[PDB]
Amino acid sequence: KPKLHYFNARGRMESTRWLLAAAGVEFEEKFIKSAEDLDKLRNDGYLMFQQVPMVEIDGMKLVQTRAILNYIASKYNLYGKDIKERALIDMYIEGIADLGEMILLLPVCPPEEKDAKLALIKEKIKNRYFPAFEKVLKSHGQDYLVGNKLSRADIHLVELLYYVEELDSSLISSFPLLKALKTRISNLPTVKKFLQPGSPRKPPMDEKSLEEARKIF
Amino acid sequence: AEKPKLHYFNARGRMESTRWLLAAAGVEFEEKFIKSAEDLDKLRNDGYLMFQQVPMVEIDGMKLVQTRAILNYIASKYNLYGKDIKERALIDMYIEGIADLGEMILLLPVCPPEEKDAKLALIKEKIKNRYFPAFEKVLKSHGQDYLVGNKLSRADIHLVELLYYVEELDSSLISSFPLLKALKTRISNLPTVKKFLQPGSPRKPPMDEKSL
Numbered sequence: 001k002p003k004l005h006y007f008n009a010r011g012r013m014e015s016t017r018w019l020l021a022a023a024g025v026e027f028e029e030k031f032i033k034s035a036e037d038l039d040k041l042r043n044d045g046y047l048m049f050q051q052v053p054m055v056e057i058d059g060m061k062l063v064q065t066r067a068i069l070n071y072i073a074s075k076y077n078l079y080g081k082d083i084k085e086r087a088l089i090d091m092y093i094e095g096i097a098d099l100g101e102m103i104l105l106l107p108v109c110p111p112e113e114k115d116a117k118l119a120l121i122k123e124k125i126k127n128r129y130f131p132a133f134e135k136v137l138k139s140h141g142q143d144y145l146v147g148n149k150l151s152r153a154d155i156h157l158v159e160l161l162y163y164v165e166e167l168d169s170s171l172i173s174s175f176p177l178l179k180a181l182k183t184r185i186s187n188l189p190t191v192k193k194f195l196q197p198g199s200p201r202k203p204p205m206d207e208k209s210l211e212e213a214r215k216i217f
Numbered sequence: 218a219e220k221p222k223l224h225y226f227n228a229r230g231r232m233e234s235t236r237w238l239l240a241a242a243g244v245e246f247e248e249k250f251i252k253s254a255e256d257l258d259k260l261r262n263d264g265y266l267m268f269q270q271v272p273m274v275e276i277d278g279m280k281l282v283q284t285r286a287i288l289n290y291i292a293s294k295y296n297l298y299g300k301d302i303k304e305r306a307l308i309d310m311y312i313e314g315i316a317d318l319g320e321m322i323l324l325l326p327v328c329p330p331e332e333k334d335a336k337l338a339l340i341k342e343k344i345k346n347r348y349f350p351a352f353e354k355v356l357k358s359h360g361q362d363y364l365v366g367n368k369l370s371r372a373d374i375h376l377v378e379l380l381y382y383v384e385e386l387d388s389s390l391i392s393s394f395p396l397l398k399a400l401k402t403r404i405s406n407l408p409t410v411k412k413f414l415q416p417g418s419p420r421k422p423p424m425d426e427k428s429l
């Protein structure tokens with residue numbers, strides 16, 4: 001079974017946890033706790049660019065978030081049925097990854113920049129990204145973003161809705177089809193299990209967890 | 218058959234890697250240059266930009282935005298994305314490293330002047346000690362002409378394009394990496410890439426003060 005190499009936090013590994021869980025794939029995590037443990041991976045040759053996330057799957061030592069996700073999504077048939085469907089999915093999820101990146105990097109922003117950056121994130125959520133995805137759902141009326149079938153785009157989008165809810169639960173309120181997608185995907189057996197207590201799902205990053213990160217990089 | 222339409226500004230920016238990839242595939246394409254904020258605004262209000270951003274590429278009945286969506290579709294269509302899922306994972310791992318390094322270089326000009334020379338010094342160190350050894354290691358590992366599967370792939374194209382940008386920043390950074398030197402020569406000599414490198418191609422110059 002796949003072995004996830006990261007530290008005990010959401011970070012750049014959480015979207016992989018979500019996708020594996022949603023595909024009903026059991027995995028182990030081998031958590032890094034120290035710079036000592038990170039250097040073990042580097043000197044043992046496990047990290048091509050000396051960086052985690054790293055996933056052991058099917059014989060490979062995959063680094064780079066998007067290489068991991070792209071491989072898992074094709075393997076478990078959540079990458080669409082042809083390259084035109086993969087292009088819609090890719091366009092959707094990279095928009096998601098652009099917004100996700102902004103939110104992921106808020107706590108490490110310079111303190112004097114944090115007010116502006118948070119404000120900017122909310123403006124783009126409301127005016128750019130949520131209308132973009134509401135218009136997709138409104139355009140075909142179906143229960144899934146692409147191909148009328150569950151795909152990584154639904155998983156990645158619903159994951160981001162949970163992080164937006166944590167930032168401001170009002171932001172999704174004007175977007176009914178996103179609301180309904182969030183509940184429908186949340187109530188899929190594998191996702192509902194992942195959302196319940198005691199799963200590998202990781203909490204928000206507090207301060208102590210934040211520092212113990214900088215102390216490893 | 219309609220040939221693909223590239224919507225960007227008349228600059229390298231986030232569109233150049235696609236120019237390289239389409240050209241190396243030997244695919245003819247048109248460019249519609251955005252020259253003002255009104256040109257950008259026209260693409261927004263016409264509904265052509267999913268996230269109100271360019272790059273945008275019209276190809277095969279779609280208006281694809283996001284650099285990585287565009288590149289993935291083009292690389293798959295022209296058989297430059299490996300033969301199976303495992304080869305894509307190697308390719309994806311490689312090109313995302315190139316994307317990481319290409320991003321720092323791309324954002325040198327629009328860094329704070331107090332922090333310019335801190336950033337450039339770190340780009341150079343990561344080149345010498347992180348990225349260039351990883352790819353030299355890949356080429357040494359199998360001793361073949363291409364990074365993956367003994368067949369030209371998007372990895373070779375993206376890597377060699379970056380090799381050109383690294384040379385522009387510091388020609389000495391490559392000198393201790395013979396297999397990267399050789400790949401750069403071999404790839405540049407492919408007929409489609411040699412054309413693209415010759416004058417009058419869609420290849421774009423380094424950005425100056427004027428393009429800012």
Ligand SMILES: CCCCCCNC(=S)SC[C@H](NC(=O)CC[C@@H](N)C(=O)O)C(=O)NCC(=O)O
Nearest residue numbers: 011012050051052053064065066213214217317
């Ligand atoms: C200051 C506090 C935190 C440090 C940086 C914020 N990122 C993290 S905490 S994630 C760990 C990080 N990995 C990546 O940046 C992934 C690359 C990316 N292309 C991908 O998608 O995989 C890492 O190993 N860095 C160590 C190092 O670079 O020497």
Ligand SMILES: CCCCCCNC(=S)SC[C@H](NC(=O)CC[C@@H](N)C(=O)O)C(=O)NCC(=O)O
Nearest residue numbers: 098230231269270271272282283284285324327
């Ligand atoms: C930036 C400092 C350095 C500037 C050099 C680069 N040039 C630009 S400005 S490229 C134009 C830009 N395009 C994107 O950001 C695309 C999204 C990206 N995730 C992709 O990969 O596609 C754009 O339209 N933003 C308008 C806007 O955000 O309102």
